[PDB]
Amino acid sequence: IEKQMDRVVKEMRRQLEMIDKLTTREIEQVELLKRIYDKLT
Amino acid sequence: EKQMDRVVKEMRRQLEMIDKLTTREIEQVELLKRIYDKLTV
Amino acid sequence: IEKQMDRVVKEMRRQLEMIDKLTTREIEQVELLKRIYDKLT
Amino acid sequence: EKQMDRVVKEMRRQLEMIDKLTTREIEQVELLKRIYDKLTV
Ligand SMILES: [Ca+2]
């Protein structure tokens, strides 16, 4: 069981990195939206 | 036991990231709605 | 320990629901983007 | 033991959702970039 819980920890850390990559993309999308809005106005 | 505490820690980290992700997604929605109103018409 | 692992399961399910709410918002944003692009073109 | 299998199951579910989330985020980025090019100029 000990070995399965270690695998789980590794996988959660992996998912965090994936969510991090999402967050960077969201930050990009927001700035691009803001720039698009500025253009319009 | 120590493994489980690690699992808990990663989960707490995941929650914080998901909340930040949610905040940014809302930012995007607000901007998009604002852009759509501008264009139409 | 058994009780801590049950708490963890509940929390993961909770996070899933949160991620689900994000996914609905993403689906909305995409359709709104598509509609905005159509207008422009 | 059965608790841990439940944890694993939820984690597998989380991965699938994160991947779907990523796919939609990319869709948004592509559309946004396309919209920005259109506007400018
Ligand atoms: Ca988004």
From TrEMBL, chains A, C:
The N-glycosyl content is primarily Man(9)GlcNAc, with a small amount of Man(8)GlcNAc. Ca(2+) binds at residues 26, 29. It comes from the Viruses. Residues 1-18 form a coiled coil. It is found in: Host rough endoplasmic reticulum membrane; Host membrane, Host caveola; Secreted. Binds 1 calcium ion per tetramer. Plays an essential role in the virus replication cycle by acting as a viroporin. Creates a pore in the host endoplasmic reticulum and as a consequence releases Ca(2+) in the cytoplasm of infected cell. In turn, high levels of cytoplasmic calcium trigger membrane trafficking and transport of viral ER-associated proteins to viroplasms, sites of viral genome replication and immature particle assembly. This is Non-structural glycoprotein 4. The chain holds residues 95 to 135 of 175 of the full protein.
